[PDB]
Design a protein around this ligand. Structure first.
Ligand SMILES: CC(=O)N[C@H]1[C@@H](OP(=O)(O)OP(=O)(O)OC[C@H]2O[C@@H](n3ccc(=O)[nH]c3=O)[C@H](O)[C@@H]2O)O[C@H](CO)[C@@H](O)[C@@H]1O
Length: 197
């Protein structure tokens, strides 16, 4: 059940339902692209044709913030509840930390993804974070990074490059990445590492 909020399909999910969908994606041997659009992303999509095509080709668009939920009141079946994409990422990580699911952290300025990894290992002990890399890489570094992601057998890839850059990166490389879930997480690395509020 999806809502066409100005071209952008938003899945009518609650935080519990969104986490169950991601856990089911881990059982399917194929790449699933996950996005968490907020009202600002919907406005960006209006001016960016490429981003709009990407948002209509993702496996799951979880709504982000109160804004998009307020705007959905125009529909016959509005969005069930306010869902924060940051909270979705931590709830998802909380569940798979005990199951030993391999995670890769790509994105943020130098050392932020290593600091986030350290903090995640303190919050959810047993989390398997197989690798990290900053999001200011060159094409030559990108080649080594995709090989590291695939060869380390990572199942979940969090891309912290900001929107639309993270979606555009995941989509450009969908045929190269051998992970089960690739999700754009924006500035969540700065928040987890403690760089930002
Ligand atoms: C409100 C919203 O949802 N969208 C904002 C944002 O999303 P978003 O808030 O995700 O964008 P930011 O650029 O502020 O977040 C980028 C994050 O990725 C990292 N980083 C950034 C760039 C890069 O090349 N590599 C990298 O690793 C940063 O260190 C940070 O952790 O996108 C645009 C920035 O272009 C803004 O105009 C939008 O208002």
């Amino acid at each position: 059940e999806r809502l066409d909020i100005f071209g952008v399909p938003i899945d009518r999910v609650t935080m519990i339902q969104a986490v169950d969908i991601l856990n089911n994606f881990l059982q399917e041997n194929r790449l699933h692209i996950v996005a968490t659009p907020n009202a600002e992303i919907v406005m960006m999509a209006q001016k960016d044709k490429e981003y709009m095509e990407i948002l209509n080709n993702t496996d799951l668009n979880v709504p982000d913030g109160s804004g998009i939920v307020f705007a959905s009141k125009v529909f016959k079946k509005p969005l069930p509840e306010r869902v924060a994409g940051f909270d979705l990422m931590l709830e998802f990580i909380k569940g798979i930390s005990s199951k030993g699911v391999k995670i890769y952290l790509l994105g943020a300025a130098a050392q932020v993804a290593e600091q986030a990894r350290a903090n995640l290992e303190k919050l959810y002990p047993g989390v398997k974070i197989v690798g990290t890399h900053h999001g200011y890489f060159t094409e030559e570094e990108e080649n080594k990074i995709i090989e590291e992601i695939n060869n380390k057998g990572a199942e979940v890839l969090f891309v912290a490059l900001g929107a639309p850059k993270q979606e555009k990166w995941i989509y450009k490389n969908k045929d190269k990445l051998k992970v089960k879930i690739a999700m754009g997480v924006g500035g969540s690395f700065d928040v987890i590492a403690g760089k930002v509020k």
